[PDB]
From a paper:
Here we report four crystal structures of the human IgD Fab that provide the first high resolution views of IgD. Membrane-bound IgD, as part of the B-cell receptor for antigen, appears to play a role in B-cell anergy in the periphery. Secreted IgD not only recognizes commensal bacteria that reside in the upper respiratory tract, but can bind to and activate basophils. The Fab structures also reveal that the IgD upper hinge adopts a unique conformation among the human isotypes, which may play a role in determining its overall structure.
We solved four crystal structures of a human anti-Phl p 7 IgD Fab: Fab1 (2.75Å resolution) solved in space group P 1 with two Fab molecules (Fab1A and Fab1B) in the asymmetric unit, Fab2 and Fab3 (1.55Å and 1.45Å resolution, respectively), solved in space group P 21 with one molecule each in the asymmetric unit, and Fab4 (2.1Å resolution) solved in space group P 21 21 21 with one molecule in the asymmetric unit. Like Fab fragments in other antibody isotypes, the crystal structures of the IgD Fab reveal a range of Fab elbow angles between the VH-VL and Cδ1-Cλ domain pairs, from 128.3° (Fab3) to 228.3° (Fab1B). Structural diversity in the Cδ1 domain is seen in the AB (residues 133-146) and EF (residues 193-202) loop regions, particularly around Arg137 (AB loop) and Trp198 (EF loop). In Fab2 and Fab4, Trp198 packs against Leu147 and Leu195, the plane of the Arg137 guanidinium group is parallel to the plane of the Trp198 indole group, and the Arg137 side chain forms a hydrogen bond with the Trp198 main chain. By contrast, in Fab1B and Fab3, the plane of the Trp198 indole group is almost perpendicular to its position in Fab2 and Fab4; in Fab1B and Fab3 the Trp198 side chain occupies a similar space, but the overall orientation of the indole group differs. Instead, in Fab1B and Fab3, the Arg137 side chain faces Pro222, and forms hydrogen bonds with Trp221 and Pro222 main chain atoms. In these molecules, Arg137 still contacts the Trp198 side chain, but the position of the Arg137 Cα atom is shifted by ~3.4Å compared with Fab2 and Fab4. The plane of the Trp198 indole group is rotated in Fab1A compared with its position in Fab1B and Fab3, and Arg137 is partially disordered, but the Arg137 Cα atom is shifted as in Fab1B and Fab3. In Fab2, Fab3 and Fab4, the Arg199 side chain extends away from the Cδ1 domain. By contrast, in Fab1A and Fab1B, the Arg199 side chain is oriented towards the surface of the Cδ1 domain.
Numbering used by the authors:
A (entry chain A): 1 to 216
B (entry chain B): 1 to 138, 141 to 225
Write the structure that this text describes.
């Protein structure tokens, strides 16, 4: 590989221990360059958290600890505090691209309420929309905590990543989260498949809903 | 203290240019290199380039190629990023970081606040509202009513569902900018529907930026 991989969501009770894994390619971590960690608190600039695998700048609490062995690095956070809630990503250097590389980012949530798996509804293109020579699949996601999901579309059994436009989660009025994802298609492609499927992943479970052109 | 400050937010049209600054203070401006990193909505961070703040040597990311230029003015204590031939994918927040040394390599120990750049070529337009539905009216599967609200600018819209005269609970969903710089969002009637009534429920969409109220009170029979 030539890029870093992280879990999208990591949760923890106040005071517990959590972990975040950064997976690297041979061209990066197997290339002698150490891993850096940065935290991005809400509406703040990214802060240098851990430099040189396990070193800590003066100002970062000792609760954050770093490790790296082989090709996988892990960031440990003991005694989870509400101040830690934010986004975290890893950084390294790649020799095949001769440049820097970053990770997908991990949202750390400090639990303030019990978890809730998302409820999902999939919507086919409307009749008025198809008469306007347009087609859009609407995947609605609501009432989930912590607020971080991963949406994957697929035409029939094969995955599709083109035309996907997913929204970031937004806190509802009852401290839960809602999101949505849209798959823009031509009316030709819609009737050119037996079914479409929206796939939502959240805290160790994936729910999938399916709609067919012939359905209703 | 080491601190980096950048220019304010910029809004441009597709295919144009933008020049964002990155002013340094609290250390020797020519001693440590400055990098540039951007992050698009829904993507990870992406490295742009490194500029040698002494002799002026620049190293750019291969993905950007001839699109970007990094300049220096030692007297001004500022680095610039000039990006040409913009498009919808360039809507992002652009950061600058300082390169600091440590016992085994290079380190980014200071980041700027970031500058938001929006590539939007959209006039003030009222939204289109389509009635979308989940389930058949032909099954005992519950029916979920929603309204699809796409093709407007700028944010935001205000939705309210009605059963006759009384307001009905709804679900609010975020608004996302499309590739064509237009926005779209959805609203869903909360309670699933047991029976079928015609014209009883209705969603009302209000967009004060264009002084318009568009409401739908009929879900056509399915295709």
């Amino acid at each position: 590989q030539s890029a870093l991989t992280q879990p999208p969501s990591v949760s923890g009770a106040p005071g517990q221990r959590v972990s975040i894994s950064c997976t690297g390619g041979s061209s990066n971590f197997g290339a002698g360059y150490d891993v850096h960690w940065y935290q991005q608190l809400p509406a703040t600039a990214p802060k240098l958290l851990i430099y040189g695998n396990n070193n800590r700048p003066s100002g970062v609490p000792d609760r954050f600890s770093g490790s790296k062995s082989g090709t996988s690095a892990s960031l440990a956070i003991t005694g989870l505090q509400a101040e830690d809630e934010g986004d975290y990503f890893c950084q390294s250097f790649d020799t095949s691209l001769s440049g820097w590389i970053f990770g997908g980012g991990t949202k750390l949530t400090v639990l303030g309420q019990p978890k809730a798996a998302p409820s999902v509804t999939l919507f086919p293109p409307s009749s008025e929309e198809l008469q306007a020579n347009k087609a859009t699949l609407v995947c609605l996601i609501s009432d989930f905590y912590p607020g971080a999901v991963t949406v994957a579309w697929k035409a029939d059994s094969s995955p599709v990543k083109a035309g996907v436009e997913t929204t970031t989660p937004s806190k509802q009025s009852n401290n839960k989260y809602a999101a949505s994802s849209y798959l823009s298609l031509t009316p030709e492609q819609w009737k050119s498949h037996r079914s479409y499927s929206c796939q939502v992943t959240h805290e160790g479970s994936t729910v999938e809903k399916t709609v067919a052109p012939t359905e209703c | 203290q080491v601190q980096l400050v950048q220019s304010g937010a910029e809004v441009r049209n597709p295919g144009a240019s933008v020049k964002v600054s990155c002013k340094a203070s609290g250390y020797t401006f020519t001693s440590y290199a400055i990098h540039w990193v951007r992050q698009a909505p829904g993507h990870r961070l992406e490295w742009v380039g490194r500029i040698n703040t002494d002799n002026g040597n620049t190293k750019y990311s291969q993905k950007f190629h001839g699109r970007v230029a990094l300049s220096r003015d030692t007297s001004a204590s500022t680095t610039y990023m000039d990006l040409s031939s913009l498009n919808s994918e360039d809507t992002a927040v652009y950061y600058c970081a300082r390169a600091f040394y440590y016992s085994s390599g290079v380190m980014f120990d200071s980041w700027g606040q970031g500058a938001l750049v929006t590539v939007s070529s959209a006039p003030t337009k009222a939204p289109d509202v389509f009635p979308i539905i989940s389930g058949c009216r032909h099954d005992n599967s519950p029916v979920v009513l929603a309204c699809l609200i796409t093709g407007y600018h700028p944010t935001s819209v205000t939705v309210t569902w009605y059963m006759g005269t009384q307001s009905q609970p709804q679900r609010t969903f975020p608004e996302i900018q499309r590739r064509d710089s237009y926005y779209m969002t959805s609203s869903q009637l909360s309670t699933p529907l047991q029976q079928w009534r015609q014209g009883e429920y209705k969603c009302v969409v209000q967009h004060t930026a264009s002084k318009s109220k568009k409401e739908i009170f009929r879900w056509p029979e399915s295709p």
